[PDB]
C-alpha cells in the first residue's frame, strides 16, 4: 500500500504568513496527489486534484507543488478563514490513502484566562454527588495547567478537563476543569481552590471559595 506521510502534524502561524504543508509518498506517485480541507464539524472539501490542479472555486492563495514523491500545499498568506485540518490523498494506487492530517492554528497575541469557579448545585448534592467546576475562558496559548486543591492540599483524581477548539473570532482557547467527588467527602472539607498555571502570567492565577 503506497504509504503517505504528512507533516507537520500541527502548525501554528500568524495571519498573512505563509503555510507549507508537506506530504511524502512511500513510492513514486507522479502527481496523483490530492489535497483536502476540513473545517470543524464539516465534511472534507475538495481543494486540489491530481496534477496540482486547483479545483474550481478555491482561492488562488492555495497551491499544490510536487511531483514523484515530494509534495507541497501552501498559503501565500494565512487568513482567519483558513483555520482547518488539511489532508493529502494519493489516488494513484489502491488502496487509496490519506495523510495524518495537518492542523492549523492562528498564532495570536498572548492572553490570560478569566478563571471562574462554581460550587456544586443543590439538586446534584441530592443525588448524592458533588462536582466543582472551573471555567478558564479566552486565553492563549493553549498550554495551561489547572490544579485542584482542597484545604491547601493537592488532589488529582476525578478531574475532567476539556478544551474547546480555537475560537473562530478571537483565536483564543477556553477550557473546562471540572472536579468530581462524593457528597460525603465534599461535606467534610472546606477550602476548594482552582489554581491555574499559564505562560501569560508568572504567579499562578487562583480562584476559590469556602464551605
Amino acid at each position: 500500500e503506497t504509504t503517505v506521510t504528512q507533516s507537520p502534524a500541527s502548525l501554528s502561524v500568524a495571519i498573512g504568513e505563509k503555510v507549507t504543508i508537506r506530504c511524502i509518498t512511500s513510492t513514486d506517485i507522479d502527481d496523483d496527489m490530492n489535497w483536502y480541507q476540513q473545517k470543524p464539524g464539516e465534511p472534507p472539501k475538495f481543494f486540489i486534484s491530481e496534477g496540482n490542479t486547483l479545483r474550481p472555486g478555491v482561492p488562488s492563495r492555495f497551491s499544490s507543488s510536487g511531483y514523484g514523491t515530494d509534495f507541497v500545499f501552501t498559503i501565500e498568506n494565512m487568513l482567519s478563514e483558513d483555520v482547518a485540518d488539511y489532508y493529502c490523498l494519493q489516488s494513484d494506487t489502491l488502496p487509496l490513502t490519506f495523510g495524518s492530517g495537518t492542523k492549523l492554528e492562528i498564532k495570536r497575541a498572548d492572553a490570560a484566562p478569566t478563571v471562574s469557579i462554581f460550587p456544586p448545585s443543590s439538586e446534584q448534592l441530592t443525588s448524592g454527588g458533588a462536582s466543582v467546576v472551573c471555567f478558564l475562558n479566552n486565553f492563549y496559548p493553549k498550554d495551561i495547567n489547572v490544579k485542584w486543591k482542597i484545604d491547601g492540599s493537592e488532589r488529582q483524581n476525578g478531574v475532567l478537563n476539556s478544551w474547546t477548539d480555537q475560537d473562530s473570532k478571537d483565536s483564543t482557547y477556553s477550557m473546562s476543569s471540572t472536579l468530581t467527588l462524593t457528597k460525603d467527602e465534599y461535606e467534610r472539607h472546606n477550602s476548594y481552590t482552582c489554581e491555574a498555571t499559564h505562560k501569560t502570567s508568572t504567579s499562578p492565577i487562583v480562584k476559590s471559595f469556602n464551605r
Binding site: 489516488s91 489502491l94 487509496l96 495524518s100 456544586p120 448545585s121 475562558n137 474547546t164 473546562s176
Partner: protein, 214 residues
C-alpha cells in the same frame, strides 16, 4: 448540484450488524463509482470501500474486507453499506462519497456524515445541573452521566449566541459528561432569565434548566 445524504448510524452492540444508506442526487448516479470513507479522531480519514458505476466491481481494504459489503441500487440512486460482525475499532463517523471516475479515483463529492458507535454501554439520559455564581457575570450548565453521543446544548433556546463556550464531552468510563458556559452583562442577570437547554436525541431527552441565583 450534487448531494449525498447518508443515514443509518447508530449505537450497535459489538459483533452486531448495521446497514447505512446514501441517497444521491443532483447528478446521474449510475455514471460514477461510489464510496464510503470513515473518519475517527485518532486515525483520521480512512477509505472503507468502493463500488464501480455498474456495481460489477467492488474494492475493500483488508481490515474491513469480508465484513463490509458495499452495494448500490442504480434505480433508487442509493448507495448502501451493510456492516457485519462490528468491532470497537469500527466506531467512527462514516461519509458517503463520489469519485469523478467510473471505477475509483480521488473523492470529489462528500456527504454529511453519519456516526456509528459500536459499544456495549447502554443508552442513558443526562443529568443537567445549573452552575450559578455563588463587569459581566458568567453562568454555566453541566450535562453529566449520559451516553451515547451527541447531546445538543443551547442558551435561551439559541437566542443567546454570544459568549457561549460548549466544551467537548469526555469519557469517564462509558458515560460522557460535558459543560457549557455563557457570559452575560451584569445588568441582564438575575433581572433577566437565563435558561439552559439540553437535548439528548439518543434517549429522546429534552431539558430546560433555569439558572437561578443560589
Amino acid at each position: 448540484e450534487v448531494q449525498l445524504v447518508e443515514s443509518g448510524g447508530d449505537l450497535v452492540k459489538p459483533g452486531g450488524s448495521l446497514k447505512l444508506s446514501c441517497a444521491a442526487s443532483g447528478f446521474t448516479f449510475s455514471s460514477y463509482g461510489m464510496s464510503w470513507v470513515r473518519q475517527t479522531p485518532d486515525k483520521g480519514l480512512e477509505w472503507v470501500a468502493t463500488i464501480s458505476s455498474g456495481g460489477s466491481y467492488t474494492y475493500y481494504p483488508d481490515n474491513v474486507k469480508g465484513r463490509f459489503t458495499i452495494s448500490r441500487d442504480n434505480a433508487k440512486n442509493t448507495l448502501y453499506l451493510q456492516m457485519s460482525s462490528l468491532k470497537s475499532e469500527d466506531t467512527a463517523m462514516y461519509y458517503c462519497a463520489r469519485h469523478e471516475d467510473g471505477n475509483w479515483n480521488y473523492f470529489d463529492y462528500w456527504g454529511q456524515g453519519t456516526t456509528l458507535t459500536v459499544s456495549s454501554a447502554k443508552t442513558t439520559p443526562p443529568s443537567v445541573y445549573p452552575l450559578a455564581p455563588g463587569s459581566m457575570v458568567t453562568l454555566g450548565c453541566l450535562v453529566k452521566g449520559y451516553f451515547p453521543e451527541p447531546v445538543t446544548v443551547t442558551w435561551n433556546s439559541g437566542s443567546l449566541s454570544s459568549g457561549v463556550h460548549t466544551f467537548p464531552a469526555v469519557l469517564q468510563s462509558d458515560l460522557y459528561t460535558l459543560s457549557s458556559s455563557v457570559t452575560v452583562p451584569s445588568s441582564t442577570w438575575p433581572s433577566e432569565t437565563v435558561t439552559c437547554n439540553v437535548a439528548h436525541p439518543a434517549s429522546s431527552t429534552k431539558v430546560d434548566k433555569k439558572i437561578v441565583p443560589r
